[PDB]
Design a protein around this ligand. Sequence first.
Ligand SMILES: CN1C(=O)CCc2cc(CNC(C)(C)[C@@H](O)c3ccccc3)ccc21
Ligand SMILES: CN1C(=O)CCc2cc(CNC(C)(C)[C@@H](O)c3ccccc3)ccc21
Lengths: 166, 166
Amino acid sequence: TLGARRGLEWFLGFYFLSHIPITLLMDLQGVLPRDLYPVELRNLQQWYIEEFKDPLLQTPPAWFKSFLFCELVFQLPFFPIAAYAFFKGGCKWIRTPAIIYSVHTMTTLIPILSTLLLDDFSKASHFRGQGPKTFQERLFLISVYIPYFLIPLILLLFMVRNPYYK
Amino acid sequence: TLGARRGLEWFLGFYFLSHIPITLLMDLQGVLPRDLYPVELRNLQQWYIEEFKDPLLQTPPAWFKSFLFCELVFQLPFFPIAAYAFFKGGCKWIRTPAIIYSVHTMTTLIPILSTLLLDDFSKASHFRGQGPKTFQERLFLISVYIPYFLIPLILLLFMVRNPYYK
Ligand SMILES: CN1C(=O)CCc2cc(CNC(C)(C)[C@@H](O)c3ccccc3)ccc21
Ligand SMILES: CN1C(=O)CCc2cc(CNC(C)(C)[C@@H](O)c3ccccc3)ccc21
């Protein structure tokens, strides 16, 4: 019926397929001009920031804004290519690019997860009137970012050791 | 003669070999306790911080702190292995590990160079007056950080298309 490799390849395909509208309509809002987005999407973003108390996409710091520029220039063009390769199967040429994407995305989230878990978001910090204050709110926000470190990690382990992609 | 390929392997070897003392004696002073270093080395880092106006090494922010731990846990054990492989040459088993190191090293410096070049280090910022203000001071600091982005960039492109490592 279905194999364990092929089933993961379908999971990787939808992960890249869903990342295209998620990046365009949500994450790149902190870098791209606001007038590119309708009023409905701009308030949709504020719903997420107010519900999850996200302080990075709200006012992007210089280090976090540099990562968003990487997501537009390097990751976003790679998402449709990776979605096709893992949906069709047998595309061995995606091996090295997928490894490059996985290590790059895993490295971007390490400072993000570390910032949300340990930093203070009250006054006397650059973030003002924003950020999680309790341990529950910090974990509630980390769970939203944590798939973009685990799934690239799974892809990295999958691409390195799979004899079919080597 | 020698050959640009072999010479690059010789250049890569000295890059990883010299990276061990640089990481152990200078870079990790922000995450390791100050007591571990003698007084001369502590003040030698004080010389670099005061002359170069380095705003990230003395009081490392959380995002920069997580990268220093990645330099200690992941990069430093890899430096002797890669130095031996490139001094000897023709080690096919270094291709995938070197690609992972390169992308990881390029990704950690994009926010670093961006902060040094564009961020605000005035006395009213959370950097508390420590940091470059003029364009020449920013480039003096970028000049010492930039080799660790270009050399991994050369390594990444080298491993991807070199047949002797496939
Ligand atoms: C800069 N960057 C990257 O370079 C790697 C991918 C990434 C990922 C993210 C996380 N994106 C959120 C949490 C917004 C996403 O999960 C979401 C979207 C809609 C509803 C709920 C959650 C934020 C930034 C980046
Ligand atoms: C976290 N990380 C990495 O993951 C890659 C290597 C790296 C490199 C650096 C930059 N290290 C300095 C600027 C300190 C070094 O060039 C130096 C040493 C002695 C005298 C002058 C300059 C800072 C952070 C990282």
